[PDB]
Paper text:
To address this question, we determined the crystal structure of nearly full-length p97 (residues 2–766) in complex with ASPL-CΔ (residues 313–500) at a resolution of 3.4 Å. Protein complex formation was induced by an ASPL-CΔ fragment that, compared with ASPL-C, lacks 53 disordered C-terminal amino acids. The asymmetric unit of the crystal contains one p97:ASPL-CΔ heterodimeric unit; p97:ASPL-CΔ heterotetramers were generated by a crystallographic dyad axis. We found that the overall structures of the p97:ASPL-CΔ and p97-ND1:ASPL-C heterotetramers are very similar (r.m.s.d.=0.66 Å for the matching α-carbons), indicating that the N and D1 domains in p97 and the eUBX domain in ASPL have similar folds in both complexes. However, the p97:ASPL-CΔ complex buries a larger surface of ∼7,000 Å2, suggesting that the D2 domain of p97 also contributes to the assembly of the heterotetramer. Overall, the structure of the D2 domain in p97:ASPL-CΔ heterotetramers is very similar to the one previously described for p97 hexamers, indicating that ASPL-CΔ-mediated remodelling of p97 hexamers does not alter the conformation of the D2 domain. However, we found a different spatial orientation, indicating that binding of ASPL-CΔ to p97 triggers a drastic reorientation of the D2 domain. The movement of the D2 domain involves a 141° rotation around a hinge located at residue Leu464 in the D1-D2 linker region, indicating that p97:ASPL-CΔ heterotetramers expose different surfaces than previously reported p97 hexamers. Interprotomer contacts between D2 domains via arginine 635 are critical for efficient ATP hydrolysis at physiological temperatures; in p97:ASPL-CΔ heterotetramers, these contacts are not observed.
The AAA+ ATPase p97, also known as VCP (valosin-containing protein) in mammals or Cdc48 in yeast, is a homohexameric ring-shaped molecular machine that together with partner proteins controls a plethora of essential cellular processes such as ubiquitin-dependent protein degradation, maintenance of quality control or homotypic membrane fusion. It comprises four domains: a flexible N-terminal domain (N), two AAA+ ATPase domains (D1 and D2) and an unstructured C-terminal tail1920. p97 is an essential protein, with orthologues in archaea and all eukaryotes. Biochemical and structural studies revealed that a C-terminal fragment of ASPL is necessary and sufficient for p97 binding. This fragment causes efficient p97 hexamer disassembly and spontaneous formation of a heterotetrameric p97:ASPL protein complex.
Author numbering:
A (entry chain B), B (entry chain B): 13 to 311, 318 to 426, 434 to 494, 512 to 584, 598 to 612, 616 to 760
C (entry chain A), D (entry chain A): 317 to 499
Amino acid sequence: STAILKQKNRPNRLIVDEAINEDNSVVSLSQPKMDELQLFRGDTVLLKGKKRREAVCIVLSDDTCSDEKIRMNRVVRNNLRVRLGDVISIQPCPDVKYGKRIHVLPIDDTVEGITGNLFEVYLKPYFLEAYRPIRKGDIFLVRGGMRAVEFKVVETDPSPYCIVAPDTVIHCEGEPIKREDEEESLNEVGYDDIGGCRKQLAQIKEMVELPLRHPALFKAIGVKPPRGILLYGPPGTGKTLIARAVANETGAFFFLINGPEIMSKLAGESESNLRKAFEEAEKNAPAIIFIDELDAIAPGEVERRIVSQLLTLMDGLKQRAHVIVMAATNRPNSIDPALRRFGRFDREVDIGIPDATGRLEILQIHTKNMKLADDVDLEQVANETHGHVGADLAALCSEAALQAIRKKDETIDAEVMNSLAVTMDDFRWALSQSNPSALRETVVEVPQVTWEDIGGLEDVKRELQELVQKGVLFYGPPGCGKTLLAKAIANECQANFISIKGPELLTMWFGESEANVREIFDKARQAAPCVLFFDELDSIAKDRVINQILTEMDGMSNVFIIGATNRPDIIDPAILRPGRLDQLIYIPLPDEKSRVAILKANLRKSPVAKDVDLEFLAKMTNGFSGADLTEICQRACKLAIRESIESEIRRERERQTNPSAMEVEEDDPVPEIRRDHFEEAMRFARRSVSDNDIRKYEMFAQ
Amino acid sequence: STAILKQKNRPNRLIVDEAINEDNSVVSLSQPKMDELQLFRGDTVLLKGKKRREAVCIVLSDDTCSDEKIRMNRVVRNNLRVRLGDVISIQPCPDVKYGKRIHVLPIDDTVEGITGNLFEVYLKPYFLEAYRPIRKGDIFLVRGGMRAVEFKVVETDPSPYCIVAPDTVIHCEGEPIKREDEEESLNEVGYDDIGGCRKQLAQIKEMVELPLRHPALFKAIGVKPPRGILLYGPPGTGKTLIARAVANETGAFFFLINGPEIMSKLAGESESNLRKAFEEAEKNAPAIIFIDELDAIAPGEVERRIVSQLLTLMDGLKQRAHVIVMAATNRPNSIDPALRRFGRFDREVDIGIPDATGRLEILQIHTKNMKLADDVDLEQVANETHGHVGADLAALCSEAALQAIRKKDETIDAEVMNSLAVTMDDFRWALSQSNPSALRETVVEVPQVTWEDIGGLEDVKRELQELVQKGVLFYGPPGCGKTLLAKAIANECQANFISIKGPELLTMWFGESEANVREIFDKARQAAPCVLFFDELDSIAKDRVINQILTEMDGMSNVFIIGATNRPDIIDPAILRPGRLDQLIYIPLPDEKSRVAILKANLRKSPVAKDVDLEFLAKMTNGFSGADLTEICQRACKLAIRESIESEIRRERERQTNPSAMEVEEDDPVPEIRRDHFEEAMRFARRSVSDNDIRKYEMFAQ
Amino acid sequence: PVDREPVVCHPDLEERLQAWPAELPDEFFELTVDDVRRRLAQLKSERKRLEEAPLVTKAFREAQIKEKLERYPKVALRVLFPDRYVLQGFFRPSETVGDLRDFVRSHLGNPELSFYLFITPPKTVLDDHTQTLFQANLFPAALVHLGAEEPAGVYLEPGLLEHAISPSAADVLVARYMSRAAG
Amino acid sequence: PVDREPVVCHPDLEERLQAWPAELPDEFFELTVDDVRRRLAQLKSERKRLEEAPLVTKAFREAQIKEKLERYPKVALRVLFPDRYVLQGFFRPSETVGDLRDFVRSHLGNPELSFYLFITPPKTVLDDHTQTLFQANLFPAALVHLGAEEPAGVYLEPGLLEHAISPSAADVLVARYMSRAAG
Ligand SMILES: Nc1ncnc2c1ncn2[C@@H]1O[C@H](COP(=O)(O)OP(=O)(O)O)[C@@H](O)[C@H]1O
Ligand SMILES: Nc1ncnc2c1ncn2[C@@H]1O[C@H](COP(=O)(O)OP(=O)(O)O)[C@@H](O)[C@H]1O
Ligand SMILES: Nc1ncnc2c1ncn2[C@@H]1O[C@H](COP(=O)(O)OP(=O)(O)O)[C@@H](O)[C@H]1O
Ligand SMILES: Nc1ncnc2c1ncn2[C@@H]1O[C@H](COP(=O)(O)OP(=O)(O)O)[C@@H](O)[C@H]1O
């Protein structure tokens, strides 16, 4: 009996697939199927699901679409009450009556925080000469004003379905409607909300889609479903996003277990929470259990206790339970290998930092609500934005949106908010204003610097030489040898050196949350012995970060740690407790003698004049730092060489008259660096410290 | 003194880089540099290296080229005696005299195996109105006849350099020249010989280029070089290829240590070989030590002994030794974690299966010698060729080349070999003729099949039921339930099932060498308990494979193993020794009763006629197998449904006259499957066994 | 060059006496065991597709356009009037939008009227009269809506309204060129 | 449209009295510490370049072509005769190959002769007279060789040979348009 209809109506029997066209009333079909049904492009069709609910959509051709498949977006799928993979029936319905009048009302939670006329803003241009097919009970959405507003169709004249003519009267009279249970939010996560990885999704769909959607047929199919999956990559990659979307699109229940959050609770309360979590999923099954940051659990007694409890629940899940456990982390290696073995977590998916082509998808997703200026090139932004994960680009578009709003109640007019355009300059601003200078490519090194290379600071050198052969904070004017001393130590102690600036600890948008804080110490531990050097500790201020540094610090020791700052006054003194770092070493501007030694050291590499007095150079340069002293010598050479070549060019030309002439007693002009070279080279600028500051440095210790 | 020239000649001071244009006489520059030197596109320039050796090349503009950089290919770099990163000096020399006569002779090893006139084939079209700049001592190459021939320039008139005019006389008189030491082979590996990964190369260059090229400046630079690197991926990916190219381009000595090969040798001889290997590299340093298949060493006493010896040599390498150890394997996990720790092998590079875009590069590399038909689209081949690593595509182009040669001495005429064109059909052939059906996507499964689902074979069922609750070979006509029985076991034993066809063990081109042989057993071990099922054991013949199967087999046991074949006569009996698999079970064509049970089992899902005699169906179908029996029932339904719908369509139309008429006593026509449905469905074909064969199956046991 | 072979259809003129399409049971909407087995193969292929990242080449595009133009040598266009009447005509793929607009002015109540053509959803108006029907996605068969500043002006034509036929009949003229070539 | 502003140069007419370029010591060819430091930064950037795989967009291409055409508003072409004489002329980027061939026939010994132009290495002959100098890679400044079936025919012209100048002088006409615009 059955095979008849399925064979008889086979041309009309199609399966749902993800749609390219994001329009509300548009569905796509394959050209052969289009012809088979004698369908024109743009023609009206009728769709029907198992739920008996119908829909009316405009049909378009798609070359990428399979013949047996039909593609429709989130809006349509919900109106038909079907999901991806579901079966629908389609017929080419020409008849549809032009609507005489319709009635449409907005959903309450989408319209929160705005005043204005939503018709003239959203519904007016949406329905204007678009001839959109519309059925009762349909929920569509219009995007504008940094917002996506949902509208519900109360009734149509005629019913159930009609199309909106320019002669059709749209009745908006009424009150915003409360949501219904049967209709999931379209602000609820889905596949179309995930950019930058199509592949990783396809891999996940392949594994979990069918077991979750209909496990009973997947049972008889014979293939063995994965019990658990390990998602890995840096933070803000869309791992939690993916889990929510997959569970949603499959119609499976979703339970989130936060790794740290469940770990806080007292002994025996945690174990009880896992059990409740799994039991609830089994009750609401088919379901997905998402464990966020798994390395916060299984990377004491109670430490193992919850892990063993987890292993029981995992191994305690039979295929019939219809539950699939998802877990996220940085790298699979950070996770207990007992978890990664076959039968528990068999497969692992890499969610990585997206390429340029991928970041464009993410941008396009988050700009869909906002109106873009014509001068905005998103793909060009994608090239300019690097190392950005999904959370960063989302934060980027969010910030850039605000910048435009910053040109200007607690409740905003819907009209002006919708008419507001975001320019490229707004993005260039947002891309500029807040971000490091993070990742940062931290590099282990073995400096060849010795004590000899450092001029002056002999009083300091001896002190440092005694301490070796718990920590040190260098402070003073920038460019006087803070960093050089740190390496001289690493060389003398014959250890590795690691240089890191403050903001490199912070993420983009100067996020106080830092996972990488320990990551430095980890590589500082990987290498050994090693000297960890924090440059610009004052830059830590964009708090939480300072403490978590102290923790990691005390946690070990052989790793030596050296801080450096040009602005020690704002450094939180808690980092300075005697137990952590005893020595506070002040490095001043090089004195008159020190400058002579520095200048000599630099000038030893190239010839120097007879008239030049080094002690006088130490005079004319005082407020100079080591960076300036090494610079002023380089400029002098640059002026010396440019002067010599223009003289050398002058000769080559003057020989054009008589090339044949050779004069033996006449010798080659010898390049020399004289006083007026330095005199002229002293201009380039500037960067000096206030005399007030010097006192603050001297008066520091206290 | 120095900084003068470098500043004075700064526009003329450039650094070597890899070239896009593979032509011999062509070098590329940046447009601003082109203008700065007042250079026309196609103009002649002169290059000079540190070696004092000059060259004359035609200059072209490149948008991808940096201003400070110049790009030249392998041919030019060797003629200038310089490598990547080296410094050269360039001047726009217009003067160059049209050659009156030149003298050019081929290199002996390149011309081996051919007769003919090499001038008319290679040199004639090469120098014809190309106006190529040529200097003495230059070694260039011409490609044709599945071959790359090197030619050396003995002398030029005038000298050292000239250009070849149509009026220039090319003197080829002489004897092929023996190679010189100073000139490396251009059939020696290089970067231009590596396709499919640019990135992985850039990562390697970044790490190892500068430490190998000039370690002393890299010393003072302060950054710490990697002591060892782990290359990983499947076989034939170019790992060994990469190692040879990197060591070559850097001018570093190259030592290969084959993992298995060094492991064969007796105790104490192996340890002595490592020491000699490292000592030789240190002697010829800067050098690269390549260890092939590292998992054959460190994944007994002597087992650990050589590993500890290795760790000593590794840790015994100081940066001053100028030696970098490269190692290759499948996955880093297969390697002892003691190796992967910091200080020994710090960094690992993934050499993977290339994407479609990458396979095009590989194709282009291996087709450079052969002349391609105009109908050949390599990029389209790249899409058609899947799962192919570099060795496979290289084997593909090699085979496809032979196919064209197969249209036709032991020594071939150079003219016809050069004029031979390779068509697309030649490739389609080669892509077709030899390859699996490998990777193969091996899938673990838990079959729902029971003993009930299998009709007949009751005598066999009981036997199998007794054995459980060391191995089994099923043999008989194909389609009688060999595979079904295997799953019935897996279900009853409540274990996992793994189905694998014979050629899936073999690689592409039916390579006898199989690493994957154990890989099946590994996953057969990963899952447990599991039933390993070899389908078509006779397909093992495209030897080495049969043994290595027996080894792995005996190595364990709980994993159960079942072979199946429709042609047991050619199966090597060594696999059948009682110690390995006792039971040899013959599954015949289903008898008359068995067929009734089978036919019933299939027909229970849909209505059946009153006149149909199942026992008669068992008559009219005898030589039928289970596959045929289940097929003939499906066709019958297909004929039954097509007949019903065309009848059902017939009614729908005949109601057009009077839709309003309803007849209650008139009922819906009931679809039935009758005898003439089966009678008609018996045509579709064919696949039967000879009556001779049946005896061979019965007479098998012996 | 081409024969337009015009016709006019309206939903009213459709017989609309057709028997109701049989309502379908929940069985029709639920999957066979093999469906799941096939659906899985869809996911696998799409996954492998993204992994290897096949090359799209300019040679392939031009080849695909050619085989597409050869499959549908004649293009059928339908202009939908605000009065619900449909104007049907045949075109070459290389015909322009202007050629369509001229085709409309021909059968109008008067050429003097100003109007515009557009495709929906969303509303996209065709400004380019140089543009071919191919690159305008009017191919192989497309429905176009006719807009106007003063729509009370455009009645199409009364004489053609007498020649007006059933929509189901207009499809049999199109189905000839869709399943098969020009004859 | 454009002024060709033709000139003729030959290597012989070059003064060739120039002092020898100073031979260079091995120091010039060896790297500074910072060179290595910079070279490393080249590898790093190129690596990161391949990793993120920047988007090449049609908008960018058209933008790059435009800024390229604006940088070099006038194209200089040099036709090299088999007799070593060089014919120089100025062209617009949108000028065709035919416009160049006509420019050659003008100054020849006679227009009656048949000839062909090509660029090397390798030998690539320009068959397309429709093709612009831009897409023929004759831009911004290119050297072209002049071939013929019977080369004994093409002498260029004797009168121009009297006007023939030094190659170093011909470059000062080009260098104006290369480092700077038309004036
Ligand atoms: N591939 C992506 N496409 C779009 N947005 C993304 C993507 N990845 C991350 N995001 C954004 O980053 C935020 C954090 O994502 P989530 O998955 O919750 O955290 P994590 O990725 O660390 O698990 C989300 O609000 C989402 O908007
Ligand atoms: N005491 C010194 N002797 C010689 N050179 C110095 C001295 N102090 C600073 N310099 C020069 O100034 C530059 C900056 O030094 P560094 O220690 O890196 O910065 P800071 O001292 O601000 O941390 C160095 O490149 C070094 O050459
Ligand atoms: N990326 C590639 N480009 C070109 N040829 C390759 C590439 N990778 C492998 N090949 C071919 O495969 C063969 C084996 O390469 P090799 O590196 O020696 O083995 P493996 O890759 O297993 O280490 C070589 O002869 C080479 O021609
Ligand atoms: N004894 C049997 N009873 C019922 N069906 C059978 C029997 N033998 C074979 N079949 C049918 O034939 C097909 C092939 O069976 P299989 O065991 O996979 O191949 P083979 O026996 O050649 O290894 C199966 O799909 C099954 O439905």
